[PDB]
Design a protein around this ligand. Sequence first.
Ligand SMILES: COCCNc1nc2ccc(C#CC3(O)CCCCC3)cc2n1-c1ccnc(N)n1
Length: 292
Amino acid sequence: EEILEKLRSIVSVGDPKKKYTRFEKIGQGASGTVYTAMDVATGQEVAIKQMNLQQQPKKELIINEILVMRENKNPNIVNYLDSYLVGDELWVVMEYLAGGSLTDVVTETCMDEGQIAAVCRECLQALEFLHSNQVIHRNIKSDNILLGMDGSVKLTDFGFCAQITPEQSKRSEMVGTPYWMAPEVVTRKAYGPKVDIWSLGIMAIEMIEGEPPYLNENPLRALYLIATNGTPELQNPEKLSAIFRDFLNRCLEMDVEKRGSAKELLQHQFLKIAKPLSSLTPLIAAAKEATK
Ligand SMILES: COCCNc1nc2ccc(C#CC3(O)CCCCC3)cc2n1-c1ccnc(N)n1
């Protein structure tokens, strides 16, 4: 389709193996292989993600990533820098911070409520910004949270991103990762930005239990469980403070009406007991030691 030509008018022109040097593969997933690099001038280090378009197309969401992200900059988001197309590959240039994913922290260490509150505050800030600009991430999970060496928190991977409008402020595309999905998305009801709030809630369960509910099961079985069970239950709910349990239940409220939004969840008292972001850095050290 001309959808490839629409993409050819968005990207920049260049080698682009002339500016950016010092390539190192630091990742490889469904979003494509990710490299670290640096362009002459400099001294800015960058991350370059590479998709094989003529080997694993989609392909409407590909363009949607660039368009939505290039005009939505925020401190709590990995920021788009540029994009090129070479051969069959699409390259996306973005900021880089070193220091692992939240996933490595939540599956190899234990976070206290002060640390969970700091991570949640930063995430809510990114969501509150996205939602105020009619943007829904639709794939909130620890895998998509990045941790700076100074304890910074950045939302990443907007490949499943979606833009709403007052004329059609809801969606019905069954997108995201099964276990982190809101019920209204699982059961194909019309859904809004509050689905990000849900997945944030599931990600808190990660930070509490080390993994999202039903993870032992299979993706489809999980979707069924989410559909049936609705609001998931902690193995040991008593291990959480009263101010934390209230926070979770306002993130995981079945009633989309009664479920909190990012703007009002930033006002929750659970975020008041938040520790400074520097407390997250020993978790990063510990995460890297179990990773070895
Ligand atoms: C946790 O994985 C470590 C490997 N790094 C990595 N994989 C990525 C996949 C997709 C995107 C992505 C993406 C976007 O959707 C974000 C909005 C702008 C367009 C591209 C970014 C990835 N990164 C980064 C990026 C920057 N720093 C670090 N440490 N890792």
